[PDB]
Amino acid sequence: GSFVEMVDNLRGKSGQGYYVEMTVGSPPQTLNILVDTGSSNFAVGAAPHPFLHRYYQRQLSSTYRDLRKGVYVPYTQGKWEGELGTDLVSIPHGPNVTVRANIAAITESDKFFINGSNWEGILGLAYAEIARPDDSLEPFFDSLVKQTHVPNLFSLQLCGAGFPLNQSEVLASVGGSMIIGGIDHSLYTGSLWYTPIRREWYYEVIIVRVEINGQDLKMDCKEYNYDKSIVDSGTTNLRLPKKVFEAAVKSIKAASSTEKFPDGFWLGEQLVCWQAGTTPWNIFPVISLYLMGEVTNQSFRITILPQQYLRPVEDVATSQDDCYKFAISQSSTGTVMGAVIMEGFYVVFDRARKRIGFAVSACHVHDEFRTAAVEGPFVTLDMEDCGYNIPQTDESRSHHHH
Numbered sequence: 358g359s360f361v362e363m364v365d366n367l368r369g370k371s372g373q374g375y376y377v378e379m380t381v382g383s384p385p386q387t388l389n390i391l392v393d394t395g396s397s398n399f400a401v402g403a404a405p406h407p408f409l410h411r412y413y414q415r416q417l418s419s420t421y422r423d424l425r426k427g428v429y430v431p432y433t434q435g436k437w438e439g440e441l442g443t444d445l446v447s448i449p450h451g452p453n454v455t456v457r458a459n460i461a462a463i464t465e466s467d468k469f470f471i472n473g474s475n476w477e478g479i480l481g482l483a484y485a486e487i488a489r490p491d492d493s494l495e496p497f498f499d500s501l502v503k504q505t506h507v508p509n510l511f512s513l514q515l516c517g518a519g520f521p522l523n524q525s526e527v528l529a530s531v532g533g534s535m536i537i538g539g540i541d542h543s544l545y546t547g548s549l550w551y552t553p554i555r556r557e558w559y560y561e562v563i564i565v566r567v568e569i570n571g572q573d574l575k576m577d578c579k580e581y582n583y584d585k586s587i588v589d590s591g592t593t594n595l596r597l598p599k600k601v602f603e604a605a606v607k608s609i610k611a612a613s614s615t616e617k618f619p620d621g622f623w624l625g626e627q628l629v630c631w632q633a634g635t636t637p638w639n640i641f642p643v644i645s646l647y648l649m650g651e652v653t654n655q656s657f658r659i660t661i662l663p664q665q666y667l668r669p670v671e672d673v674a675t676s677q678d679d680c681y682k683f684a685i686s687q688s689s690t691g692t693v694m695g696a697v698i699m700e701g702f703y704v705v706f707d708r709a710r711k712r713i714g715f716a717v718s719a720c721h722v723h724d725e726f727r728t729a730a731v732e733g734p735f736v737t738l739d740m741e742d743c744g745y746n747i748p749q750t751d752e753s754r755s756h757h758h759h
């Protein structure tokens with residue numbers, strides 16, 4: 358029940374993602390790799406870039422094989438492209454195994470790498486369905502499971518910062534654990550509650566109810582999952598569908614109304630500050646997301662604090678003060694349970710049993726009045742289906758799946 362060698366194997370800078378050290382090639386070349394449950398490609402910088410201190414040198418690897426195939430991956434806010442191949446991959450502070458995995462060698466990118474994030478690649482931990490160029494490119498975790506005896510499960514403890522902050526010139530350092538192949542009981546307290554993975558593509562889940570300070574938002578529950586809800590270590594914020602975001606902000610504004618913040622704050626474009634150590638946490642409400650349980654008609658709630666959704670940023674010009682960014686934001690692609698949610702909890706990606714576990718994280722940030730919580734069961738007599746069915750494009754329909 359112990360996985361000591363994998364504890365504290367994640368690092369990062371606040372808001373710039375959590376990375377794990379990996380080696381690629383023979384002999385092993387060290388790279389820091391973003392841990393991303395919201396994508397499904399293993400892709401690494403493989404050429405010089407202003408924001409890279411180092412990169413994967415295919416030519417230096419005796420075990421590298423070229424797949425003679427390129428890949429082009431555009432996102433909303435950036436893009437990367439490169440050449441597909443395979444090589445030997447290991448996680449030094451992970452299981453004592455080495456696997457031959459697909460690797461996209463990133464040769465050109467725009468707005469993908471981040472200055473000072475200290476990572477050089479991305480480890481997509483989601484399913485084949487959303488891999489590029491297509492679902493025939495086996496993701497890393499699938500290879501790991503197929504080639505080794507590693508159980509088909511991983512778990513994440515993301516630990517946020519962290520006031521008072523160490524530094525004024527750089528962003529706050531963060532830490533965490535990625536436990537590959539099991540569950541480490543020292544990383545959580547209390548009960549572990551499981552929600553079904555609705556479909557294996559993203560880690561998609563269903564939210565059945567939302568409360569802000571114990572007040573039901575009272576929307577049709579399909580609105581909470583429009584057009585999907587996913588658990589995503591590669592997103593910083595809690596992102597909410599437009600209508601849900603508007604209702605949440607209205608509610609949080611109402612609770613915190615003793616303080617009149619500029620509109621820029623609610624848009625996540627401006628910091629708000631209090632004198633060191635005087636932040637009035639109690640005027641900001643807790644937020645509860647009820648997730649579908651394993652049993653029909655059951656749910657459980659995960660409850661986060663303002664300490665999760667107000668992100669600390671130490672401004673140089675006002676290091677006298679504790680300043681915060683509002684880290685709930687609008688989505689047009691459904692709910693994204695990012696680091697804002699995940700930093701509250703130990704999260705178990707139980708692929709073997711098509712479910713996601715949540716328990717209170719032994720490292721979550723709290724005060725003496727309130728804690729992040731995982732609580733259940735809650736039962737509802739006559740349950741609506743809260744899942745949304747994405748309109749089927751002819752594009753998507755025409756695909757064959759041999």
Ligand SMILES: NC1=N[C@@]2(c3cccc(-c4cncc(Cl)c4)c3)CCCC[C@H]2O1
Pocket residue numbers: 372373374375393394395396432433469471589590591592593
């Ligand atoms: N899930 C997730 N991963 C990204 C991505 C790409 C590059 C950088 C990041 C990233 C940047 N800053 C902070 C984080 Cl946590 C991730 C994320 C790739 C897939 C779609 C958009 C992003 O959503």
Ligand code: NI
Pocket residue numbers: 757758759
């Ligand atoms: Ni066919």
